[PDB]
PDB file of C-alpha atoms in Angstrom:
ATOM      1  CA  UNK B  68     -14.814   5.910  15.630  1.00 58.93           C
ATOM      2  CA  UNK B  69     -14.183   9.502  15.289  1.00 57.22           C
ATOM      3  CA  UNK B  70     -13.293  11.196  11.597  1.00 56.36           C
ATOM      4  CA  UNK B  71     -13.467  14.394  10.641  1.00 56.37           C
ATOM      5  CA  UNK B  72     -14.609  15.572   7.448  1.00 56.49           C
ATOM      6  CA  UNK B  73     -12.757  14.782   4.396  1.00 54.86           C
ATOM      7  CA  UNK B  74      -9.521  16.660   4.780  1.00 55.32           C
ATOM      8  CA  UNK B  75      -8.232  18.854   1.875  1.00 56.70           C
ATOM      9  CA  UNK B  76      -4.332  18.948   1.145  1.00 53.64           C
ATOM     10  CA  UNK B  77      -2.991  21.379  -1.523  1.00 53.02           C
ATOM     11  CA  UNK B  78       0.758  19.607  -2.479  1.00 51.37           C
ATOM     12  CA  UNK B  79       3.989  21.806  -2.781  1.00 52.96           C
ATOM     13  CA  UNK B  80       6.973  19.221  -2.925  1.00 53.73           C
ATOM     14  CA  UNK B  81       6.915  15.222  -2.001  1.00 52.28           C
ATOM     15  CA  UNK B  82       7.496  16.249   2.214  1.00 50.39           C
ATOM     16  CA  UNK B  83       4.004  17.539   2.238  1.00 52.58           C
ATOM     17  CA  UNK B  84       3.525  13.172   1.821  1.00 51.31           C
ATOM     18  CA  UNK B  85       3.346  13.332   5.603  1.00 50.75           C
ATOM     19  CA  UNK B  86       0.011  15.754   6.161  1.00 49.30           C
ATOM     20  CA  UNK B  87      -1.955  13.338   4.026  1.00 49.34           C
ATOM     21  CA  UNK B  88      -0.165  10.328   5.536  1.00 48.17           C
ATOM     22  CA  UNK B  89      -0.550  11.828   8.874  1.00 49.57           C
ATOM     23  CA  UNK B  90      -4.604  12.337   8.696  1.00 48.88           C
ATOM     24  CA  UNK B  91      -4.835   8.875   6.730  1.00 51.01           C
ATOM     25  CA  UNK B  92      -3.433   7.549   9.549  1.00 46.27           C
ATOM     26  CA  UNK B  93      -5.691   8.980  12.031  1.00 46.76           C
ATOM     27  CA  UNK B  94      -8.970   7.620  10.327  1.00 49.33           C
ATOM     28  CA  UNK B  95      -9.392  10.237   8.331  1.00 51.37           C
ATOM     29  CA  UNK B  96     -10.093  10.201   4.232  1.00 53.04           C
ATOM     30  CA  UNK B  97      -7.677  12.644   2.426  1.00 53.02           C
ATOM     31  CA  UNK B  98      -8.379  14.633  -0.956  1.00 54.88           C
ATOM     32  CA  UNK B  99      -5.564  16.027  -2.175  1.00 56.39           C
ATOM     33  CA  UNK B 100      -4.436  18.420  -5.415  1.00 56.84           C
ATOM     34  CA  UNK B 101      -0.905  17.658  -7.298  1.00 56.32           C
ATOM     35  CA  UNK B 102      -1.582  20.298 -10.398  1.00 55.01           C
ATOM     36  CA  UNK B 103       1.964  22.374  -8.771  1.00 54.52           C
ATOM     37  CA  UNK B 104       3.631  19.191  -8.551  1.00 52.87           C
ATOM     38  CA  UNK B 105       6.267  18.072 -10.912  1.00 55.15           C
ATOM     39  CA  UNK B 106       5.341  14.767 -13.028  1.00 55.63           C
ATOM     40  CA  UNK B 107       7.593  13.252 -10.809  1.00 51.48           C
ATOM     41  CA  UNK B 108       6.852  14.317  -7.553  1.00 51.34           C
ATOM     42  CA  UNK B 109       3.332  13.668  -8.246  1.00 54.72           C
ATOM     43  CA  UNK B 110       4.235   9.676  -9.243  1.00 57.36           C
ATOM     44  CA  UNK B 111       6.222   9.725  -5.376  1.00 58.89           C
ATOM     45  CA  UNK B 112       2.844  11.237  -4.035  1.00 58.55           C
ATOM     46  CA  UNK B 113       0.713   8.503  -5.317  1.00 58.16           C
ATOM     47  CA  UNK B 114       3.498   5.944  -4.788  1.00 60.14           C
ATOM     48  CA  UNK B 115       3.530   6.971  -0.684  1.00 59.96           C
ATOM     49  CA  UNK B 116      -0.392   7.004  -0.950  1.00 61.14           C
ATOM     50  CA  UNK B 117      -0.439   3.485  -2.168  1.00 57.70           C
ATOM     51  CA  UNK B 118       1.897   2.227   0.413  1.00 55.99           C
ATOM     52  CA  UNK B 119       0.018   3.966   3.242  1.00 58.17           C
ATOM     53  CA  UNK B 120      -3.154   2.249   1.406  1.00 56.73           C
ATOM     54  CA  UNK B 121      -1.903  -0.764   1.426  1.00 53.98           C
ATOM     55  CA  UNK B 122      -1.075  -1.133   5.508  1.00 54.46           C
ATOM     56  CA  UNK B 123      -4.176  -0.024   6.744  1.00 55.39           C
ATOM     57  CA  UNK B 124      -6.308  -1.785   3.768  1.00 54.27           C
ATOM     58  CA  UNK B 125      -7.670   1.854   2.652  1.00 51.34           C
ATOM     59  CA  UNK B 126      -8.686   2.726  -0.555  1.00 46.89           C
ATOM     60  CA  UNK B 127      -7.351   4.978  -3.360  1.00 47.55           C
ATOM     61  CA  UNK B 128      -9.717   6.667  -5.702  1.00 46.19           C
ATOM     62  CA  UNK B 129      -8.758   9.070  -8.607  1.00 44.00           C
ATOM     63  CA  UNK B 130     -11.130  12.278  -8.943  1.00 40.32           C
ATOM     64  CA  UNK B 131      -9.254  13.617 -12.051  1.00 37.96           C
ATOM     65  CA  UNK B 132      -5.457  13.843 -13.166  1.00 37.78           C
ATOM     66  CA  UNK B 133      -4.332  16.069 -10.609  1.00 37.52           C
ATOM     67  CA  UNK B 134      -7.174  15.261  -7.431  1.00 39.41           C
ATOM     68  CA  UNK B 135      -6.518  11.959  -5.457  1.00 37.62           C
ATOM     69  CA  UNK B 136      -8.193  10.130  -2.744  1.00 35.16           C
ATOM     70  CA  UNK B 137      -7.667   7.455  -0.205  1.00 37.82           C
ATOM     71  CA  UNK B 138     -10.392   6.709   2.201  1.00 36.62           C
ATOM     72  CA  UNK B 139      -9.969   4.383   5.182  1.00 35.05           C
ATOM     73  CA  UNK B 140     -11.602   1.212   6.506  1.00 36.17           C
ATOM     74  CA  UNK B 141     -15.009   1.493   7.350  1.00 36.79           C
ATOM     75  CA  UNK B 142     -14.980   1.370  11.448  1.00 36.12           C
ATOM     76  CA  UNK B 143     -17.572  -1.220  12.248  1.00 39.32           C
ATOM     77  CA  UNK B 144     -17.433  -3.578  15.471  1.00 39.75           C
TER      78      UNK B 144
ATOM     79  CA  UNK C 115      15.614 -11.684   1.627  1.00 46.99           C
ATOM     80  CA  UNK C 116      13.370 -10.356  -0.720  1.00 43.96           C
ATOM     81  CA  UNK C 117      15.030  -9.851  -4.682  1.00 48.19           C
ATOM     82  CA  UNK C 118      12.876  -7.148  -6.609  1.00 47.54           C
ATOM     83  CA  UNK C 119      12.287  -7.677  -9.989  1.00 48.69           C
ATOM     84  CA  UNK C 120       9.517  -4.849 -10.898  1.00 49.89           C
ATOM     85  CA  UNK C 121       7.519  -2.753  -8.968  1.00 51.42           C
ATOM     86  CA  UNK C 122       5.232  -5.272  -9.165  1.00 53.57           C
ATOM     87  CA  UNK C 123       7.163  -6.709  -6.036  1.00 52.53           C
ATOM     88  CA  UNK C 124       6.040  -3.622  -3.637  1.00 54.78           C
ATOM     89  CA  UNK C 125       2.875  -5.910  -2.261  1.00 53.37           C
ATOM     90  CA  UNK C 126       5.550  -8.689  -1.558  1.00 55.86           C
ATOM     91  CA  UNK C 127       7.347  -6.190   1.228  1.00 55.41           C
ATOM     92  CA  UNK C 128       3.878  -4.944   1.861  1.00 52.39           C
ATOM     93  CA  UNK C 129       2.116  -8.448   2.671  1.00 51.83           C
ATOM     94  CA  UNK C 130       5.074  -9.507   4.514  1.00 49.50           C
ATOM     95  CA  UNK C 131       5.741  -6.140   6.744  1.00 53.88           C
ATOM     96  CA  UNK C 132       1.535  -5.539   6.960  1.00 55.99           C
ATOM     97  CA  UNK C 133       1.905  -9.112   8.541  1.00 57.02           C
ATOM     98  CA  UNK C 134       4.255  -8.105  10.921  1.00 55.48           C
ATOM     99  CA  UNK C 135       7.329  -8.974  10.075  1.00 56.42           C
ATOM    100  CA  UNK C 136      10.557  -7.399   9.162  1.00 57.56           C
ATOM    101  CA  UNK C 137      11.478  -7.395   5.762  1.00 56.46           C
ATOM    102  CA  UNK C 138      14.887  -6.796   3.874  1.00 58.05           C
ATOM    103  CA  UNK C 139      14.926  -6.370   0.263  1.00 58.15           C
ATOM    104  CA  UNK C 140      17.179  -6.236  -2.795  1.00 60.37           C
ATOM    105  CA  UNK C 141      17.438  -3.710  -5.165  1.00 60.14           C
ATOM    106  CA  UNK C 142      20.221  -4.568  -7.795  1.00 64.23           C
ATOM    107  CA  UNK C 143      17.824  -5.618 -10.251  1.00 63.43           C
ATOM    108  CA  UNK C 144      16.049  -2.279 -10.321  1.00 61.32           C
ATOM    109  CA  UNK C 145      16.400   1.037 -12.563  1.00 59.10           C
ATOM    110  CA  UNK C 146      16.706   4.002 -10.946  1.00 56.55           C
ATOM    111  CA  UNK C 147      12.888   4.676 -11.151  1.00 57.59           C
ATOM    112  CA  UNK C 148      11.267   1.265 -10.108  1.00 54.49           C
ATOM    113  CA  UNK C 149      13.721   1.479  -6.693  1.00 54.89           C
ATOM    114  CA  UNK C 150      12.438   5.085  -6.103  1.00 55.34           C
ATOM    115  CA  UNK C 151       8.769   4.162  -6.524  1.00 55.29           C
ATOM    116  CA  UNK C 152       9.593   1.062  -4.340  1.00 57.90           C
ATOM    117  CA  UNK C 153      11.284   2.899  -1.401  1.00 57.05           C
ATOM    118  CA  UNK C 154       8.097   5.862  -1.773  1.00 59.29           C
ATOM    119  CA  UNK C 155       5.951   2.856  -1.412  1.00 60.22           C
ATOM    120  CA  UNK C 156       7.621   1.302   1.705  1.00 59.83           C
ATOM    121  CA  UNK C 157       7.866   4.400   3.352  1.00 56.92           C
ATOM    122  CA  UNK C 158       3.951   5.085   2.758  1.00 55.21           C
ATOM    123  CA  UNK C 159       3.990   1.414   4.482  1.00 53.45           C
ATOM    124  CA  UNK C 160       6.451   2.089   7.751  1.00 53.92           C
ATOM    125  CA  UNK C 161       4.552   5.449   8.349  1.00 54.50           C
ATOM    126  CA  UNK C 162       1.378   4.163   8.221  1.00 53.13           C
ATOM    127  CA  UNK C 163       2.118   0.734  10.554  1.00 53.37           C
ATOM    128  CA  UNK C 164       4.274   3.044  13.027  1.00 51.81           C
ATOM    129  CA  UNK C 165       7.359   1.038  10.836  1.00 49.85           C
ATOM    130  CA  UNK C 166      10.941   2.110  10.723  1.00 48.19           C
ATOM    131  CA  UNK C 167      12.999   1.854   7.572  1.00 49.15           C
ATOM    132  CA  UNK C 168      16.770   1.466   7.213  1.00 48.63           C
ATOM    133  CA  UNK C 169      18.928   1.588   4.287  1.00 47.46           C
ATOM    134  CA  UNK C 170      21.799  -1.130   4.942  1.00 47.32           C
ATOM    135  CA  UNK C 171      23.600  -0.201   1.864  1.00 47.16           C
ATOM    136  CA  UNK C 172      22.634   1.625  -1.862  1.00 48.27           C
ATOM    137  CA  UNK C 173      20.946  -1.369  -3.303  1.00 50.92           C
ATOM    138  CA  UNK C 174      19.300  -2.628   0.168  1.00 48.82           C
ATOM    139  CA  UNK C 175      16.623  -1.255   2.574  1.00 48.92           C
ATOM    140  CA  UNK C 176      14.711  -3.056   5.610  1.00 49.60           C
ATOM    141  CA  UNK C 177      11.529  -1.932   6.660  1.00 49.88           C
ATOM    142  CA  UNK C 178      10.610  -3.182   9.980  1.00 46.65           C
ATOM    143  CA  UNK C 179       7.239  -3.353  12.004  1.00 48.58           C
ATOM    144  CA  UNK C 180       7.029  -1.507  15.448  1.00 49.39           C
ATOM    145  CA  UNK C 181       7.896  -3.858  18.405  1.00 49.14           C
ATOM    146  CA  UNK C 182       4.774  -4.909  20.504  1.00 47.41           C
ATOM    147  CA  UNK C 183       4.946  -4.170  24.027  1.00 49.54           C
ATOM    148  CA  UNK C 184       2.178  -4.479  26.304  1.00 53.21           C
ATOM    149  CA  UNK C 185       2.090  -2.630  29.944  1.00 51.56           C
TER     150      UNK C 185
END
Protein backbone atom coordinates (compact mmCIF):
# COMPACT_ATOMS: atom_id res chain seq x y z
CA UNK A 1 0.00 0.00 0.00
CA UNK A 2 1.13 3.44 -0.53
CA UNK A 3 2.70 5.71 2.58
CA UNK A 4 4.58 8.47 2.45
CA UNK A 5 7.34 9.23 4.61
CA UNK A 6 6.83 9.77 8.19
CA UNK A 7 4.85 12.96 8.35
CA UNK A 8 5.96 15.78 10.75
CA UNK A 9 3.18 17.88 12.65
CA UNK A 10 4.25 20.90 14.78
CA UNK A 11 0.91 21.34 17.38
CA UNK A 12 -0.64 24.87 18.06
CA UNK A 13 -4.05 24.15 19.92
CA UNK A 14 -6.06 20.58 20.23
CA UNK A 15 -7.90 21.34 16.33
CA UNK A 16 -4.57 20.71 14.80
CA UNK A 17 -5.82 16.75 16.29
CA UNK A 18 -7.22 16.43 12.78
CA UNK A 19 -3.77 16.80 10.49
CA UNK A 20 -2.29 13.95 12.47
CA UNK A 21 -5.62 12.10 12.57
CA UNK A 22 -6.11 12.87 9.01
CA UNK A 23 -2.57 11.31 7.69
CA UNK A 24 -2.99 8.40 10.40
CA UNK A 25 -5.87 7.68 8.71
CA UNK A 26 -4.52 7.54 5.32
CA UNK A 27 -1.72 4.91 6.18
CA UNK A 28 0.56 7.15 7.07
CA UNK A 29 2.85 7.17 10.54
CA UNK A 30 2.70 10.65 12.24
CA UNK A 31 5.53 12.35 14.47
CA UNK A 32 4.37 15.07 16.08
CA UNK A 33 5.84 18.01 18.67
CA UNK A 34 3.49 19.30 21.74
CA UNK A 35 6.46 21.54 23.53
CA UNK A 36 3.78 24.94 22.62
CA UNK A 37 1.02 23.01 23.90
CA UNK A 38 -0.56 23.59 27.20
CA UNK A 39 -0.29 20.49 29.77
CA UNK A 40 -3.67 20.09 28.95
CA UNK A 41 -4.02 20.32 25.47
CA UNK A 42 -1.17 18.07 25.13
CA UNK A 43 -3.13 15.18 27.49
CA UNK A 44 -6.35 15.83 24.64
CA UNK A 45 -3.58 15.32 21.89
CA UNK A 46 -2.46 12.03 23.15
CA UNK A 47 -5.99 11.16 24.33
CA UNK A 48 -7.34 11.66 20.35
CA UNK A 49 -4.06 9.76 19.30
CA UNK A 50 -4.97 6.82 21.40
CA UNK A 51 -8.47 6.65 20.21
CA UNK A 52 -7.44 6.93 16.55
CA UNK A 53 -4.83 4.05 17.66
CA UNK A 54 -7.09 2.08 18.93
CA UNK A 55 -9.65 1.78 15.64
CA UNK A 56 -7.23 1.06 13.19
CA UNK A 57 -4.98 -1.22 15.68
CA UNK A 58 -1.89 1.34 15.18
CA UNK A 59 0.65 1.90 17.48
CA UNK A 60 1.71 4.78 19.78
CA UNK A 61 5.31 5.29 20.63
CA UNK A 62 6.78 8.12 22.85
CA UNK A 63 10.17 9.73 21.45
CA UNK A 64 10.54 12.13 24.46
CA UNK A 65 8.06 14.32 26.64
CA UNK A 66 6.99 16.55 24.06
CA UNK A 67 7.59 14.13 20.51
CA UNK A 68 4.84 11.42 19.91
CA UNK A 69 4.27 8.74 17.46
CA UNK A 70 1.65 6.45 16.12
CA UNK A 71 2.50 4.21 13.29
CA UNK A 72 -0.07 2.13 11.42
CA UNK A 73 -0.65 -1.55 10.62
CA UNK A 74 1.85 -3.09 8.67
CA UNK A 75 0.03 -3.58 5.03
CA UNK A 76 0.69 -7.18 4.22
CA UNK A 77 -1.78 -9.46 2.05
CA UNK B 1 -25.79 1.39 27.65
CA UNK B 2 -22.44 1.64 28.64
CA UNK B 3 -21.87 3.29 32.60
CA UNK B 4 -18.20 4.74 32.84
CA UNK B 5 -16.50 4.32 35.84
CA UNK B 6 -12.71 5.46 34.93
CA UNK B 7 -11.06 6.09 31.93
CA UNK B 8 -10.19 2.79 32.10
CA UNK B 9 -13.67 2.21 30.33
CA UNK B 10 -12.51 4.08 26.91
CA UNK B 11 -11.50 0.39 25.30
CA UNK B 12 -15.11 -0.74 26.35
CA UNK B 13 -16.70 2.04 23.71
CA UNK B 14 -13.66 1.32 21.64
CA UNK B 15 -14.05 -2.66 21.36
CA UNK B 16 -17.65 -2.28 20.98
CA UNK B 17 -17.74 0.74 18.21
CA UNK B 18 -14.20 -0.86 16.47
CA UNK B 19 -16.66 -3.91 16.21
CA UNK B 20 -19.14 -2.10 14.54
CA UNK B 21 -21.61 -1.24 16.56
CA UNK B 22 -23.16 1.82 17.97
CA UNK B 23 -22.45 2.61 21.33
CA UNK B 24 -24.13 5.01 23.96
CA UNK B 25 -22.45 5.76 27.10
CA UNK B 26 -22.90 7.29 30.55
CA UNK B 27 -21.04 9.83 32.03
CA UNK B 28 -22.52 10.74 35.55
CA UNK B 29 -19.98 8.88 37.28
CA UNK B 30 -17.14 10.88 35.79
CA UNK B 31 -15.08 14.13 36.96
CA UNK B 32 -14.78 16.68 34.74
CA UNK B 33 -11.35 15.37 33.48
CA UNK B 34 -11.91 11.53 33.01
CA UNK B 35 -15.25 12.60 30.68
CA UNK B 36 -12.97 15.01 28.68
CA UNK B 37 -10.23 12.42 28.13
CA UNK B 38 -13.11 9.95 27.33
CA UNK B 39 -14.95 12.09 24.71
CA UNK B 40 -11.00 13.09 23.14
CA UNK B 41 -10.68 9.39 22.99
CA UNK B 42 -14.00 8.58 21.18
CA UNK B 43 -13.61 11.21 18.88
CA UNK B 44 -9.93 9.91 17.94
CA UNK B 45 -12.22 6.59 17.47
CA UNK B 46 -15.31 8.08 15.14
CA UNK B 47 -12.64 9.97 13.00
CA UNK B 48 -10.57 7.29 12.45
CA UNK B 49 -13.59 4.48 11.60
CA UNK B 50 -15.41 7.30 9.40
CA UNK B 51 -17.79 7.33 12.97
CA UNK B 52 -20.18 10.05 13.92
CA UNK B 53 -20.59 11.16 17.50
CA UNK B 54 -23.63 12.74 19.17
CA UNK B 55 -24.06 14.21 22.47
CA UNK B 56 -27.78 13.24 23.61
CA UNK B 57 -27.53 15.24 26.69
CA UNK B 58 -24.40 16.69 29.20
CA UNK B 59 -23.68 13.41 30.81
CA UNK B 60 -24.36 11.17 27.52
CA UNK B 61 -22.67 10.78 24.09
CA UNK B 62 -23.17 7.98 21.26
CA UNK B 63 -20.60 7.26 18.95
CA UNK B 64 -21.80 5.40 16.02
CA UNK B 65 -20.02 3.37 13.15
CA UNK B 66 -20.55 4.52 9.45
CA UNK B 67 -23.49 2.63 7.76
CA UNK B 68 -22.31 -0.03 5.16
CA UNK B 69 -23.64 0.34 1.83
CA UNK B 70 -22.52 -1.53 -1.03
CA UNK B 71 -23.23 -0.33 -4.87
Amino acid sequence: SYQSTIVPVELHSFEDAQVIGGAFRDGDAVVFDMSLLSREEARRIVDFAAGLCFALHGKMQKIDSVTFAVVPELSNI
